[PDB]
């Protein structure tokens, strides 16, 4: 099994990086002078998609992409979008997570070609200009990212507890595929910053049961867990699919990216 598998309750994830919702929203008010609340969550979705596509092009497992996605969220949970360009931060997160998850150091030419190749072919509607950063910018940004995260590198995700829950049900073949995609979809939200991974897993498993119309009422009732918190998570997941329906990413994002607060350069 993986290092620190059963240690979530004594982990830095739990003790430091499960945040209070109101502190998260207070720190967000800096960026909400420029963007609306709606435009702010649309950016969250966009950059989640960018990290997914970077990960796919580099042929990394979903665990590495998830860890990279959490690093990105953690960063902009505390700082403004103007502090570091998120086009630089996104590939830096994949690069760092790839090391932590022990897949290795992605080469310089390979990381930069991936960034370049992903923005051009899959995101040209949002980005007319070519990827402007070289590897020295990545190495610099990696130091800023490691500092803010307080060197908390190990991250727990809902996929492991989800896999254990569906095995207990004995409904692995039926429910796992759909529940797995719903866990992917939660990374479009703040849920990984607000709730423990096992709670998100149960919520995703619950929605999969409703969608596929399999009664698990008695299974869920047999659990010893705060069921009111599981309902909070479900409402966000159901809200997320209504957001998805009404969001035309490809028409809107060029206008939203230009509304992001711009960095102050040196006086010169």
């Amino acid at each position: 099994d993986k290092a620190m598998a059963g240690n979530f309750w004594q982990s830095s994830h739990y003790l430091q990086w499960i945040l209070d919702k109101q502190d998260l929203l207070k720190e967000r008010q800096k960026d909400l002078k420029f963007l609306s609340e709606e435009e702010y969550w649309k950016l969250q979705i966009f950059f989640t998609n960018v990290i997914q596509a970077l990960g796919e092009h580099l042929k990394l497992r979903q665990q590495v992409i998830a860890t990279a996605t959490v690093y990105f969220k953690r960063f902009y949970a505390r700082y403004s979008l103007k502090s570091i360009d998120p086009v630089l931060m996104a590939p830096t997160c994949v690069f760092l997570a790839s090391k932590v998850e022990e897949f290795g150091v992605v080469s310089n030419t390979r990381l930069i070609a991936a960034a370049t190749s992903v923005l051009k072919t899959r995101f040209s509607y949002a980005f007319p200009k070519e990827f402007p950063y070289r590897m020295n910018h990545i190495l610099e940004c990696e130091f800023y990212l490691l500092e803010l995260m307080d060197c908390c590198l190990i991250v727990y995700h809902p996929y492991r507890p989800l896999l254990q829950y569906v095995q207990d049900m004995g409904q692995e073949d039926m429910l796992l595929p759909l529940a797995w995609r719903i866990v992917n979809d939660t990374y479009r939200t703040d849920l990984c910053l607000l709730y423990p991974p096992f709670m998100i897993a149960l919520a995703c498993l619950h929605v999969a049961c409703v969608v596929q119309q399999k009664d698990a009422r008695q299974w869920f009732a047999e659990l010893s867990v705060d069921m009111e918190k599981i309902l909070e998570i479900i409402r966000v997941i159901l809200k997320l699919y209504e957001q998805w329906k009404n969001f035309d990413e490809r028409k809107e994002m060029a206008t939203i990216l230009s509304k992001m607060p711009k960095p102050k350069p040196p006086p010169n």
């Binding site: 099994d1 598998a5 240690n7 403004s80 502090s83 090391k99 908390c152 960095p263 102050k264």
Partner: protein, 334 residues
């Protein structure tokens, strides 16, 4: 493209290692993993010592990343503890702040071997604490992979006097603590491999010399196996059925004959070093030093051995209130 007010704010608030700590000319360790210093705080809130490690290389290598990732999560009395991580932006060097441990088993065994063997209360307390630390790491699926006396640190004077701290110092390479499966080309490290090394350390603590000492000669190491067979004997098929599955098994068969080691046994070895074969210490050692890795006991099982209920019981302070005779760390200069 990075905001200027953000850059200068962080640069202003950022703690630099040279500003917080005094360490020029206080180097205590050098090796493959970099440099270790004995450091004092400049703003004198305490007079406590600190171990300050500069990681070999620059930036965030696989080595730096792995060390930071693990030790940031690990928390146990018998495992060396990380206090702070310093990222120097000027030179891209990474500095780690640890607890300072004045002693270790390499220097303690060397001191007694220079005679006066190790006190028996001390040996039991050392083995218990080593087993306690490794049980915690193994429970968290963290393997050490290089247990040896140099990596068993022991705290000097202060509030943690005589507590064992497991560490990984690096490197001058010996196979004296390497289980036979690794010598026969085992591809993967295991919990069992660590236990074998603890069995070697325990034998060394009892007798003062390394049980599988070997002259300085790929996975296959003939001379190191020959030494294990001189002490343990050559294993029967019954004793280790899956020895056949080892990649180097056919080479083992080409180079060795069981007949050669017919009058060899761990009993016979330990009798020569005045350790009784019907003592609870020996019966524990035998279970640690079992050739077949699936037939070795676990660290949890070793901790429950009646050895540790026999008089004297192990103590938190390994020195048990007695004056520490061992010298402090000399500084290095190159």
């Amino acid at each position: 493209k990075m905001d200027y007010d953000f850059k200068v704010k962080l640069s202003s608030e950022r703690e630099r290692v040279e500003d917080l700590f005094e360490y020029e000319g206080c180097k205590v360790g050098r090796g493959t993993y970099g440099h270790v210093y004995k450091a004092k705080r400049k703003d004198g809130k305490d007079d406590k010592d600190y171990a300050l490690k500069q990681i070999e290389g620059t930036g965030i290598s696989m080595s730096a990343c792995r060390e930071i990732a693990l030790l940031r999560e690990l928390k146990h009395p018998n495992v060396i503890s990380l206090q702070k991580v310093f990222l120097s932006h000027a030179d891209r060097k990474v500095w780690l702040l640890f607890d300072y441990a004045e002693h270790d088993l390499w220097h303690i065994i060397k001191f007694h071997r220079a005679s006066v063997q190790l006190p028996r209360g001390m040996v039991k307390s050392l083995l218990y604490q080593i087993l306690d630390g490794i049980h915690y790491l193994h429970a968290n699926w963290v393997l050490h992979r290089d247990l040896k006396p140099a990596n068993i640190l022991v705290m000097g004077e202060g509030p943690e006097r005589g507590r064992v701290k497991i560490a990984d110092m690096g490197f001058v390479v010996t196979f004296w603590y390497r289980a036979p499966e690794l010598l026969l080309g085992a591809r993967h490290y295991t919990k069992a491999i660590d236990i074998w090394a603890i069995g070697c350390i325990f034998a060394e603590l009892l007798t003062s010399e390394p049980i599988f000492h070997c002259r300085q000669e790929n996975p296959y190491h003939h001379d190191q196996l020959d030494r294990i067979f001189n002490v343990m004997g050559f294993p029967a098929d019954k004793d280790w059925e899956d020895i056949k599955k080892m990649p180097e098994h056919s080479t083992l068969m080409k180079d060795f004959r069981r007949n050669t080691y017919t009058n060899c046994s761990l009993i016979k070895y330990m009798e020569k070093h005045k350790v009784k074969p019907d003592s609870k210490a020996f019966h524990l050692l035998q279970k640690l030093l079992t050739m077949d890795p699936i037939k070795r006991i676990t660290s949890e099982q070793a901790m429950q051995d009646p050895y540790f209920l026999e008089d004297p019981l192990p103590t938190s302070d390994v020195f048990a209130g007695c004056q520490i005779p061992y010298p402090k760390r000399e500084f290095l200069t190159e």
